[PDB]
């Protein structure tokens, strides 16, 4: 807690505003009040008379739609001296430094004599307010000229909190009174006196626009406009009572900004409605009560951490929208009501004002999810979470912040089509003041009703919506709008539910004798798409059936049909980014591959079933030692293989899945290594013979494995299953592991570091591999999108020639970090969201100073405890102490399976580690510069290939794409097993050996999967190399130089590049075609 | 075009 408390204090002083600018603004607006005093009064005027007053003036009255017409504007207009006051955060002195800038809210109280008791009907008070603003702007403008301040002051109108009904004047300063450095803008709010209109008449249920339907939005604006100082006085009291009021406020402010939460309007579409004031008003209420029994949940003695914890805890678990609401008295213990108004409600009995009126239902769930999601990190003790909760902006990219994004282009967008405009209807102008508010509600409701359980959260954003307009104009002007609609286009963003996203059929209400209302709306909503279907269980229900595709999810089709049918038949819905991502995933060459969804693992299961049949045979075979257990460890067994398994597609590198065979513990195992495997081979030999005799349909052969250094006698049995799958079997013996330890102990001190590396690979293949496949497999079920995203991640690495040096396990652990540790983000539920988040992590990962440690557990045991957590931390510090610059080790990946942290990340050259991070950083930079689109995504997955010193082009004799099981094909294994090799791609084996020979001098790379990244034929692969700095320049000759060089002087040599190329060329033989240097 | 990043051999990008 002490660490967290000090972290808070550090954050506050960093964001603390500089007091010098406070004086600078205080100097200005203090004089501004004097200018307001000069402004003269006015007499009663009709709309005709005020219009004559403003016909020729540069200023234009910003009348709120519907603008007053001569018939209904019988009530007259007048201006009188307001009672100025300063309100907002600046009044409470709780503001902070904001690079984008802050705003100071100065309130103008229209004198009460300028209103009638019934001016809150039919925009009567609003239009009076508009001219009052207009009259002030004219006089303020001329006086600004008189004082010569106009030179550096720019004046424009704007909507308060993006509220179209409340235009305001904004003062900002361009580059003595110049406050441009202060980064502040004075906002002039024309508020109403308190209690001018009976608040009971302004309750949300009541209506104030005659046409009856209620007017919650219109009622809130006028009532809120009349209640500003009262809340300030309410807040002003509280900060005395609790010493930590302003501190608790700013922590809320920073938290809200990172999540992209603001006080601005939300029914328009912008995510927000919950701002500092709502955070402050809420937290004030909790200090006065908040419980069902009206007990205090927060105490004035609480510190900033406790005050912040309670409000975040409060918002997380108690519901304010559907079931339950709060009432408090600003002027009486606050109590939680179980009843709900179906909308975010924070009632104030003293003022009869709901503070959450601007807060939308859809946004409220997201707000609730964030608080509850953060409450989990706040309670977390294993890991520090200060940075994530507060120092991480998740609103930078929507696609990172939202799983799916669809942009919809409405028709006729210099006015919207008559049909869509006609759909607006009069009941909705009274309900929704602006068509933008109505249209956002329309698209939300159909999208929510259509998708249902397929999604968790939906956000509708109106791209290109402006809120400030020139003083010469009455309302905001959009380029496509033509003063009709203030937006460019609508973007539909979702947080999908992986569990039920891809369901083929959307279930509906059950059949009945009489058509029920719920069923009725179901049939009407889906129209022809509606159908009544029966199932195996025998239930009869109304449901509509969709079709799965390998290119796009069901979510794309449903929203397209639903929006077109209800919103407008001419709408255009397009999300090509996900489609391009889907296409990059290699399409398997199985029946109905195209119609298969990306989340289906039937291919993997079929491979497992084939293994099960063999798994039975080997048990029943009699051997000298009873078989103990066979543990499959292949990539496909954990649903991580880049391309799905395909029968007889033996050209695939991952065709042969490794399998560990272990026998009963015996004392007769050889005590010397070389005999031990040769005994293991003897066991494999007998297994092959009996398998050949009893089960002739199975085919088998032996192969040479040399992955473990210096153990040149480990022999593996490759089994070709009749279903068309390959399995590689290796024997594990308990004596095996001690023998390697024996080798390390007896080895010379200089050689011990080499031997331990040999052990490191052994445990990586035999011991840790078992644990790796087990946990990833089980975890993969909860994380539906893990199996796809990892495969694209490996595909992305292969394109840039990184898989050759990066072990497949390491890629998996990097790719699961966004899932086991999604904070501050959510669990990815989309292919795009998961992949880019992996990119985001790698870009910002400081592997030199920050270790990567993962809790391989299912979503909320085996969770890392404090002792284990600290233990892993000490390991990183000890390693970095020996390797500060990180040459020997770059990536530190540890978990329960890997406490050492070096198992899967050892031996990677630093250039490849830097190249990996360098690629991730640049990729993120491209995203910021240019948005996700077809052009960018192509750049992400195409290799530059120019940075490499020399590049070698290779082509295989035949196209391997068909034999790899990739649909742009063998149906049986060759009669002669020697004929497997002719359809193989050996370039990786070429590179690995060439790496060994030129380890001291060169770093060669190539594409592992040629069928995927080898063109249409899958036959072209490229070998790329790098010359180290030391051998790039000339060197003095010495015996230990260990490089192919040529003389220049009697004691100087230089790298012999041309000789190396010839060695490379003839090694590939006919494979090599061209050399680029 | 393509994603091209200058190869770093001193871990300077980090």
């Amino acid at each position: 807690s002490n660490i967290f408390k000090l972290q808070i204090d550090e954050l506050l002083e960093q964001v603390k505003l500089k007091q010098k600018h406070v004086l600078k603004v205080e100097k200005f607006l203090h004089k501004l009040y004097d200018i307001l005093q000069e402004i003269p009064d006015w007499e009663e005027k009709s709309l005709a008379e005020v219009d004559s007053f403003f016909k020729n003036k540069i200023v234009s009255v910003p009348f709120v739609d519907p603008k007053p017409i001569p018939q209904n504007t019988n009530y007259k207009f007048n201006y009188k001296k307001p009672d100025i006051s300063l309100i907002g955060s600046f009044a409470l002195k709780a503001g902070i430094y904001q690079p984008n800038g802050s705003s100071i809210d100065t309130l103008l109280t229209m004198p009460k004599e300028l209103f009638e008791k019934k001016d809150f009907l039919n925009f009567r008070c609003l239009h009076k307010r508009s001219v009052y603003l207009a009259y002030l702007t004219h006089h303020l403008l001329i006086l600004l000229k008189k004082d010569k301040l106009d030179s550096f002051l720019q004046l424009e109108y704007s909507y308060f909190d993006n509220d179209p009904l409340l235009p305001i004047l904004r003062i900002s300063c361009s580059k003595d009174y110049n406050f441009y450095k202060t980064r502040f803008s004075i906002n002039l709010l024309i508020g109403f006196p308190y209690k001018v209109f009976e608040p009971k008449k302004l309750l949300p249920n009541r209506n104030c626009i005659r046409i009856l339907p209620a007017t919650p939005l219109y009622n809130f604006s006028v009532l809120s406009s009349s209640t500003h100082e009262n809340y300030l006085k309410y807040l002003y009291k509280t900060k005395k009572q609790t010493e930590s009021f302003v501190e608790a406020t700013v922590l809320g402010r920073l938290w809200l900004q990172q999540r992209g939460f603001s006080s601005n309007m939300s029914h328009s579409g912008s995510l927000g409605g919950f701002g500092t004031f709502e955070f402050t008003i809420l937290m004030a209420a909790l200090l006065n009560g908040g419980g069902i029994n009206s007990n205090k949940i927060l105490l004035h003695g609480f510190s900033s951490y406790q005050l912040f914890k309670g409000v975040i805890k409060y918002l997380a678990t108690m519901d304010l929208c559907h079931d339950g609401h709060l009432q408090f008295h600003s002027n009486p213990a606050s109590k939680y009501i179980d009843e709900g108004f179906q909308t975010p409600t924070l009632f104030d009995k003293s003022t009869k004002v709901n503070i959450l009126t601007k807060m939308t239902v859809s946004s409220y769930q997201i707000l609730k999810e964030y608080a509850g999601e953060t409450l989990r990190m706040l309670n977390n003790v294993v890991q520090d979470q200060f940075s994530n909760i507060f120092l991480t902006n998740i609103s930078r990219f929507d696609n990172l912040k939202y799983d799916l994004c669809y942009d919809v282009q409405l028709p006729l967008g210099n006015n919207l089509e008559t049909s869509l405009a006609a759909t607006f209807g009069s009941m909705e102008r009274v309900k929704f003041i602006t068509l933008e508010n109505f249209l956002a509600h329309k698209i939300t409701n159909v999208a929510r009703y259509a998708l249902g359980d397929r999604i968790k959260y939906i956000q509708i954003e109106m791209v290109g919506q402006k809120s400030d307009f020139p003083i010469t104009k009455r309302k905001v002007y959009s380029n496509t709008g033509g003063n009709h609609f203030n937006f460019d286009f609508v973007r539909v963003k979702l947080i999908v539910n992986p569990s039920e996203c891809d369901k083929l059929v959307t279930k509906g209400p059950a059949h009945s004798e009489t058509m029920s209302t719920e069923a009725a709306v179901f049939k009407n909503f889906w129209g022809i798409k509606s159908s009544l279907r029966r199932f195996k269980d025998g239930s009869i229900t109304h449901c509509c059936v969709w079709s799965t595709s390998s290119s796009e999810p069901i979510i794309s089709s449903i929203v397209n049909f639903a929006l077109q049918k209800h919103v407008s038949k001419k709408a255009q819905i397009s999300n090509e980014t996900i489609k391009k991502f889907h296409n990059f995933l290699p399409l398997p060459n199985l029946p109905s591959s195209a119609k298969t969804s990306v989340l289906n693992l039937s291919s993997f299961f079929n491979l497992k079933k084939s293994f099960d049949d063999l798994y039975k045979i080997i048990f029943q075979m009699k051997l000298p030692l009873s078989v103990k257990s066979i543990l499959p460890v292949g990539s496909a067994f954990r649903y991580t293989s880049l391309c799905q398994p395909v029968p007889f597609a033996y050209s695939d590198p991952d065709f042969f899945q490794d399998v560990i065979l272990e026998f009963e513990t015996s004392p007769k195992w050889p005590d010397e290594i070389t005999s031990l495997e040769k005994a293991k081979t003897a066991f494999l030999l007998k297994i092959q013979e009996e398998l050949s005799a009893n089960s002739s349909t199975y085919r088998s052969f032996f192969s040479r494995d040399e992955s473990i250094p210096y153990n040149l006698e480990i022999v593996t049995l490759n089994i070709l299953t009749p279903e068309g799958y390959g399995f590689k079997f290796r024997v594990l013996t308990e004596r095996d592991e001690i023998l390697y330890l024996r080798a390390i102990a007896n080895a010379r001190n200089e050689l011990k570091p080499e031997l331990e590396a040999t052990f490191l690979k052994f445990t990586a293949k035999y011991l840790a591999s078992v644990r790796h496949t087990r946990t990833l497999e089980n975890i993969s079920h909860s994380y539906q999108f893990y199996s796809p995203v990892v495969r694209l991640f490996k595909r992305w690495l292969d394109t840039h020639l990184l898989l050759g040096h990066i072990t497949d396990e390491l890629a998996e652990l990097i790719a699961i970090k966004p899932f086991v540790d999604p904070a501050p983000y959510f669990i990815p539920g989309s292919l795009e969201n998961g992949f880019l988040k992996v990119l985001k992590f790698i870009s910002q990962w400081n592997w030199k100073d920050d270790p990567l440690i993962l809790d391989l557990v299912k979503p909320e045991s085996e969770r890392l405890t404090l002792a284990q957590y600290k233990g892993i931390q000490m390991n990183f510090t000890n390693l970095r102490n020996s390797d500060p610059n990180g040459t020997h080790l770059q990536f530190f990946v540890a978990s329960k399976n890997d406490p050492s942290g070096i198992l899967y990340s050892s031996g990677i050259p630093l250039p490849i580690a830097t190249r990996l991070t360098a690629l991730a950083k640049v990729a993120v930079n491209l995203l910021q510069t240019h948005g996700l689109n077809q052009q960018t995504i192509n750049l992400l997955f195409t290799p530059g290939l120019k940075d490499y010193d020399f590049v070698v082009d290779l082509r295989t004799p035949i196209g391997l794409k068909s034999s790899c099981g990739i649909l742009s094909a063998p149906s049986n294994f060759p009669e002669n097993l020697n004929d497997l090799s002719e359809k193989m791609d050996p370039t990786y084996q070429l590179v690995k050996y060439l790496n060994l020979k030129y380890k001291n001098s060169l770093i060669l790379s190539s594409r592992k999967y040629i069928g995927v990244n080898g063109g249409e034929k899958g036959d072209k692969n490229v070998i790329t190399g790098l010359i180290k700095p030391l051998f790039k320049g000339a060197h003095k000759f010495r015996v230990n130089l260990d490089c192919n060089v040529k003389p220049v002087d009697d004691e100087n040599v230089i790298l012999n590049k041309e000789a190396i190329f010839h060695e490379i060329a003839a090694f590939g033989n006919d494979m090599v075609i061209n050399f680029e240097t | 075009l393509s994603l091209s990043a200058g190869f770093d051999w001193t871990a300077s990008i980090l």
Binding site: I673, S675, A682, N746, M984, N1040, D1050 | -
Partner: protein, 240 residues
């Protein structure tokens, strides 16, 4: 071009490279010096550095055969020692783990000849060979780079012969059981020193080498503070 011998004494031995379409007068350069050693198996050898990729004994038989013909020198190569183009055989794990069955730079190797008559002949031919690159590079020899061993190495994906493997396993273990048998008898045979000290060997012990390494690998509580007059006298001293 003019360089013929290196100051530290390694003679340059240039080679002409093969002609290939991918590679449209590129040369490969070897560096050699006479090797001196008292060891017999290392005697009559020549240091080589910067060998071509996969240089087996047959390659040098061609090269020395080439040198013999042009300069009419009788030189015959026995073998190529310490040729590890990829470092597979740098460490002998069999020797490390146990003594039974195994009683035991880089980019360099030792090239052994039949007799001292061959080596002084070959070295003199090598010196004249170096001089050519300065004067007449065209007559420089060409490295074929292709040998039967190369083809086997190129064929990475070749299933092993089951019949051959079966014989190898049988012969290997059959020797092992013999070596294991004698080792176990030796330890449990009542070993007695020249001065009559009988070694103690535990049951199940198999190798005397094992016993040695176990040795290499590998009162205070009964002391009581209060038994003697001086002890309590010391206690009485500190008590006050």
């Amino acid at each position: 071009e003019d360089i013929s011998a290196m100051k530290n004494g390694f003679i340059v031995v240039p080679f002409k490279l093969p002609d290939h379409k991918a590679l449209p007068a590129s040369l490969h350069f070897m560096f050699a010096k006479r090797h001196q050693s008292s060891n017999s198996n290392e005697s009559d050898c020549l240091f080589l550095v910067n060998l071509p990729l996969l240089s087996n004994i047959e390659h040098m038989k061609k090269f020395v055969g080439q040198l013999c013909g042009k300069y009419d020198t009788v030189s015959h190569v026995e073998e190529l020692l310490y040729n590890d183009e990829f470092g597979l055989h740098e460490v002998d794990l069999s020797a490390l783990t146990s003594d039974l069955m195994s009683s035991t730079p880089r980019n360099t190797a030792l090239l052994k000849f039949v007799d001292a008559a061959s080596i002084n002949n070959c070295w003199n031919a090598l010196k004249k060979y170096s001089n050519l690159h300065a004067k007449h590079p065209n007559e420089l020899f060409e490295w074929t780079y292709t040998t039967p061993s190369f083809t086997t190495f190129v064929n990475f994906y070749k299933p092993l012969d089951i019949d051959y493997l079966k014989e190898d396993i049988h012969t290997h273990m059959a020797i092992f059981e013999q070596r294991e048998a004698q080792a176990q008898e030796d330890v449990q045979s009542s070993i007695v020193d020249e001065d009559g000290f009988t070694l103690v060997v535990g049951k199940n012990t198999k190798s005397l080498n094992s016993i040695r390494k176990k040795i290499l690998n590998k009162i205070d509580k009964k002391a009581k503070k209060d038994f003697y007059r001086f002890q309590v006298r010391e206690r009485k001293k500190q008590e006050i």
